[PDB]
Amino acid sequence: PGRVEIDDVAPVVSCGVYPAKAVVGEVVPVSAAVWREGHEAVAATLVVRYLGVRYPHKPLLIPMTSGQEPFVFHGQFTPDRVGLWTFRVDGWGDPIHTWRHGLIAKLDAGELSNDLLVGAVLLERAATGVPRGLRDPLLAAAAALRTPGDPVTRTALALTPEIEELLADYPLRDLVTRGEQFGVWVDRPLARFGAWYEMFPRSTGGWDDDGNPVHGTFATAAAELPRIAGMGFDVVYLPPIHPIGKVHRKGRNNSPTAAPTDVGSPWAIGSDEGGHDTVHPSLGTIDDFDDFVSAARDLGMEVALDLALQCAPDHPWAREHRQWFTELPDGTIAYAENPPKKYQDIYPLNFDNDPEGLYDEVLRVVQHWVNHGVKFFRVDNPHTKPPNFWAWLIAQVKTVDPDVLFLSEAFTPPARQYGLAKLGFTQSYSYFTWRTTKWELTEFGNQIAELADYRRPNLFVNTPDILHAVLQHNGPGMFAIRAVLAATMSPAWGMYCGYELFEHRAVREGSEEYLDSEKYELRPRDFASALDQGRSLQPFITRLNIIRRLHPAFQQLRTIHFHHVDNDALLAYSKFDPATGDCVLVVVTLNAFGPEEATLWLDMAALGMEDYDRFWVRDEITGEEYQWGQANYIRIDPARAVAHIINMPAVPYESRNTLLR
Amino acid sequence: PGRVEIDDVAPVVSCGVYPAKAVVGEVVPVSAAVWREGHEAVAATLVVRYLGVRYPHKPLLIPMTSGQEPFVFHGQFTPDRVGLWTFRVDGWGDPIHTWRHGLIAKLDAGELSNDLLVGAVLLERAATGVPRGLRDPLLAAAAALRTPGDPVTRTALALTPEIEELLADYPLRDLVTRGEQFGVWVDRPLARFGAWYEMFPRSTGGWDDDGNPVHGTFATAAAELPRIAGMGFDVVYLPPIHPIGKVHRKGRNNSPTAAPTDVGSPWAIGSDEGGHDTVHPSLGTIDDFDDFVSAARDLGMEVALDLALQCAPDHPWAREHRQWFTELPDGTIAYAENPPKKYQDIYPLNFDNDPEGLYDEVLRVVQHWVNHGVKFFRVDNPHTKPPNFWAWLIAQVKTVDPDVLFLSEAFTPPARQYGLAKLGFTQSYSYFTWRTTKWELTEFGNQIAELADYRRPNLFVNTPDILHAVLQHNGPGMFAIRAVLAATMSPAWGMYCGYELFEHRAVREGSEEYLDSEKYELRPRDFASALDQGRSLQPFITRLNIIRRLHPAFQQLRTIHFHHVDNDALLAYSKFDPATGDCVLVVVTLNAFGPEEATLWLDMAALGMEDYDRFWVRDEITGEEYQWGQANYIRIDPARAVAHIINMPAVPYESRNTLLR
Numbered sequence A, B: 001p002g003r004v005e006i007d008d009v010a011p012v013v014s015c016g017v018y019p020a021k022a023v024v025g026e027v028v029p030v031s032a033a034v035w036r037e038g039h040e041a042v043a044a045t046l047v048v049r050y051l052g053v054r055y056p057h058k059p060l061l062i063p064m065t066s067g068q069e070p071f072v073f074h075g076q077f078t079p080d081r082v083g084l085w086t087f088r089v090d091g092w093g094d095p096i097h098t099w100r101h102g103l104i105a106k107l108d109a110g111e112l113s114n115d116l117l118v119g120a121v122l123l124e125r126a127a128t129g130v131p132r133g134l135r136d137p138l139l140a141a142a143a144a145l146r147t148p149g150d151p152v153t154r155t156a157l158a159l160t161p162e163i164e165e166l167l168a169d170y171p172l173r174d175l176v177t178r179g180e181q182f183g184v185w186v187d188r189p190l191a192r193f194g195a196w197y198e199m200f201p202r203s204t205g206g207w208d209d210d211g212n213p214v215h216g217t218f219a220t221a222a223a224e225l226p227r228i229a230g231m232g233f234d235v236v237y238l239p240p241i242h243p244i245g246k247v248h249r250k251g252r253n254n255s256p257t258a259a260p261t262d263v264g265s266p267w268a269i270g271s272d273e274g275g276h277d278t279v280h281p282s283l284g285t286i287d288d289f290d291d292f293v294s295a296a297r298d299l300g301m302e303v304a305l306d307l308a309l310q311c312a313p314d315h316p317w318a319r320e321h322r323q324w325f326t327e328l329p330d331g332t333i334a335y336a337e338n339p340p341k342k343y344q345d346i347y348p349l350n351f352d353n354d355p356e357g358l359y360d361e362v363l364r365v366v367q368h369w370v371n372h373g374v375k376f377f378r379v380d381n382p383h384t385k386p387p388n389f390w391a392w393l394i395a396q397v398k399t400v401d402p403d404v405l406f407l408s409e410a411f412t413p414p415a416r417q418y419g420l421a422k423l424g425f426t427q428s429y430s431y432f433t434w435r436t437t438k439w440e441l442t443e444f445g446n447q448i449a450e451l452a453d454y455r456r457p458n459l460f461v462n463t464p465d466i467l468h469a470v471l472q473h474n475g476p477g478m479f480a481i482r483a484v485l486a487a488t489m490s491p492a493w494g495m496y497c498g499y500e501l502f503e504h505r506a507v508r509e510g511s512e513e514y515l516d517s518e519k520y521e522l523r524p525r526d527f528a529s530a531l532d533q534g535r536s537l538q539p540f541i542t543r544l545n546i547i548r549r550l551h552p553a554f555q556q557l558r559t560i561h562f563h564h565v566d567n568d569a570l571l572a573y574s575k576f577d578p579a580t581g582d583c584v585l586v587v588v589t590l591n592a593f594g595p596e597e598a599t600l601w602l603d604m605a606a607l608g609m610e611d612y613d614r615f616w617v618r619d620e621i622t623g624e625e626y627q628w629g630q631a632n633y634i635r636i637d638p639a640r641a642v643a644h645i646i647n648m649p650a651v652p653y654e655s656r657n658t659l660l661r
């Protein structure tokens, strides 16, 4: 006990402490190592069971197949309902296979008088497992050489294509041993595949007769939702919609002192007007929000709200519940700090003084919005709050409603960043922005999965906080380039408003902060004119999102594969879908300014073709079709197209094993 | 629950199912990831406990240090007694460090008055934890930071190295969190470091007046033990000493039919004379064995017996207990087979018919020899017997006597080979023989550990069954080369008798079987003449083992590191000892025939030196000394020396950190 060894099971996360991640309709590949004594054959069955919903802290049997690696068995299952699933690998020794294969070897050299009876004692014993109806042809197979005679006489009834297939249906299993049980938590598909748009509701004001921005409202914001849907975004992410503190409120450009009219950063949550459960009054009544949400839902979109666990001084909690802060000896509370950033306008919470006190309130707050149709939260700076809290908050929320999803904006070293994902965060921001070399992007891409069992990255081209240097000086071409990279590399990607307008001016050289940042200032934008003057990337983005919807390969984490292109400025990779066999290849240039050309060397095995093969491809932007082979010429001219997104011949029905591991 | 995150702990094997491996006086490096909220400091303590001498199914505290990888903490402990040890990592937040480090920054920019009081309640509260009269210079500091004044005035004793070292012995810990507990099974040092010599007792006969071999006896064999000890071997491994079956006994050169005088293979255990518990009568009474063991013991050596769970037909078990076999329909028992090898002289056992029946008998047998001083067994073909048996047998034996060690001769694909090691085998044979190119050996060497936490390889230059082709035609030079490789790469190595005589003739071209194999035939050898005629590698081997004893670096699994040599035929690697700092470099040629030269590029960081450094080395065979630097000229002439074994400057007391991971 264990009679048959089962080891190195995957996917298991942190040795089973945390469930693995998957979504509905995703092919989940499972593998394990099973072995036993000698050359005696062994087989494994992947046992999948679907439990209820519920959240952590009749069976379905799938046969597994051996492969290249000795003793390593592979399997798959596709979850069809949201919730918690279980799998384990059962190992057994299948005597029939041993006997059959051994006899065929002996059959070639023509006596054997012994083995045949042994077979003959197998199939009837096998017969006990099969129902009297179809039970019978084995006994037919079982009684055609117990009667003496030639060897080839009854090999008929053994090598018959009819009895492996029934035995496949009902197998004769010996020494059955069960492996450990591990769990997968399946979420709705939006957890993996969807595109994000970050907009500031207040910036939808649109100026007055004097050229001065006007504070917008949920009503006006909702007016902008169609153009957004038009670009193909599935989720709209809103900076906090709560009242902005009036004390120590910051002025334009992170200025310490606020003018009387300045608006302050939405992240300075709380004022005498309200807390985390109240809409900032300038935006509108809470019904207005309900109306905005409903508007989005009409267009096929979802709303994601910023969850920032911090307080401005006027926040009711500063008075009503003050245990929740770390108060200095002179009674003041130290302003929030994240090195080297300073947040003079807010207070960090203290989760240790009154844990079940604060815990319950924050749960209360999150639940408020769940009741208003918000089932995706962009958790803000999760790494500066206790891990166990998040683990608690997530499980606590998801158990009442399991369709609630969390995105963790944790720009922090790996152990924390990936660590946080493990606790349950459905998606995580990534280090993506700071990957810009062919080698960096290659590595960033491959790691994507790799870590798929527990991290889903959301690739944002920019955020209000991050205006990468490369975007600053390379002109509109680069904006395309990052967009192509983001959209193709990950199932989930995002964009901060104005990106499509090529906003590229930073506050000072060497900074990553947007000049005249929207956080501190109202920023109406006039998208329409840009469209008219052909200085908008809105069309391109639309075409990018359409492509994603069109090809299911782009909803996959696991299958990215990089092909060699002998140019340091050109990067070429491919994705495929295990289900439909869909297959797509992307080639992009990382230099926005000069045409760059090269020879692209496909790894045909990876694409499901032999090396010598020749095949036809289609360019999804152009529609042009051409014939390609293992080595192909490619030349990319920015200012014509910064990328070729190529539809490739569908991966044959060997899809499932090109997914192995 | 889980306030401070502790994850990715190592060493853990198969997620804790199996204990890790270590020996007495071995430095075991432990690492884990610990993190918490924000920039609040965190610390970890490695907690070691020594339990018993019992075997698987007051605390010692070691502080752990951060390092290169954020949030990753490293530690080490050195077991001083045989038995089962436990370790876990405890994580805590140390507020003092947060406070101190923050203050130094503030101290430079010169009121700030708030923080000082905060410190004051820390050291006081810190002091309460040290309720000893050695406390507290802290109130000296604790009442040296409260009264009004300048900051540097009241920094008094805080920055000065007087209260941290005190805090070091007694620390102020917050949010202490317990990590999971994992176990290490510590064995006697021979488990890792010792050299093996394989000899056939029967071959010590020495001819008669006609030039005909004479069967030897334990008495005569014991006569050869000094010479063996003289070469520096710590263990003598004996093919089975039991009676050889008389039916289907195999003849010289594996011929199927045995002449009346032929001896047969010792692995055909059992005859009407006796079973596994009896000495083959031709060797002598069991007292003779006891005498042989004692002879070895006198010379500093150990005896290891072959444990082969198989039977010849005349074996008493064939009648007395026949449930133990797989009996055919016609009542015969199929002869043992291991593809493609055929073992016509033996019967495989059947472990499923009467498990606790057979289990108990084999335990009985193993136990017999343990009582006769044999505490190392060379388990034979373990992969052809059930895993659970071995797991049981090992745990069952070791619990009565924990100094009993097992070596698994499992030449099988990885999942099995390493799997077998994991469930308890103290050492394992390896694929070593078939690694012969610079890149193959490099990969093989690095893997050694890697897998050290659960596999200890025993590197055999040859075995009675394996006479590698490379030895067949490259002449005495190669025998040196493999010996250098085996002896240096692994703490444990071995050689089969006659290797030192350059026995290089195989039965047919393309085979790995020794011509006129000792298994089937008596082979007395005359070592003395070879010594006299200078055609023996006995001197070299002696010098190799002395070197191993001399430098503790060579008893390490973990520390091998490969340095670049720009010649495909030259391989250069180094080992060091974390304890003493000993450091050694080996450079060998893989080409036995032509002089080969190159530039050797040391990774000085790995050797504990800066790149620009210049240092002195000594050649352990030659005694010559010279000055070297980062890049050095090296030229190797076989037929002079196939290797340079170089003593290098001792790794500084940064030994612990170059062992990290």
Ligand SMILES: OC[C@H]1O[C@H](O[C@H]2[C@H](O)[C@@H](O)[C@@H](O)O[C@@H]2CO)[C@H](O)[C@@H](O)[C@@H]1O
Pocket (backbone or CB within 6 Å): A254, A265, A266, A267, A268, A308, A310, A342, A343, A344, A345, A346, A380, A381, A409, A464, A465, A519
């Ligand atoms: O008002 C508080 C804080 O707001 C902004 O910082 C935000 C940041 O923009 C968000 O992306 C979030 O992830 O982090 C901070 C809030 O947690 C301003 O940049 C900052 O100056 C201000 O103090």
Ligand SMILES: OC[C@H]1O[C@H](O[C@H]2[C@H](O)[C@@H](O)[C@@H](O)O[C@@H]2CO)[C@H](O)[C@@H](O)[C@@H]1O
Pocket (backbone or CB within 6 Å): B250, B254, B265, B266, B267, B268, B308, B310, B342, B343, B344, B345, B346, B380, B381, B409, B464, B465, B519
């Ligand atoms: O006597 C049975 C069998 O003995 C030998 O095979 C051995 C082998 O030499 C040992 O090294 C061991 O590891 O495996 C076998 C026993 O399990 C002969 O090689 C073989 O011909 C003979 O049948």
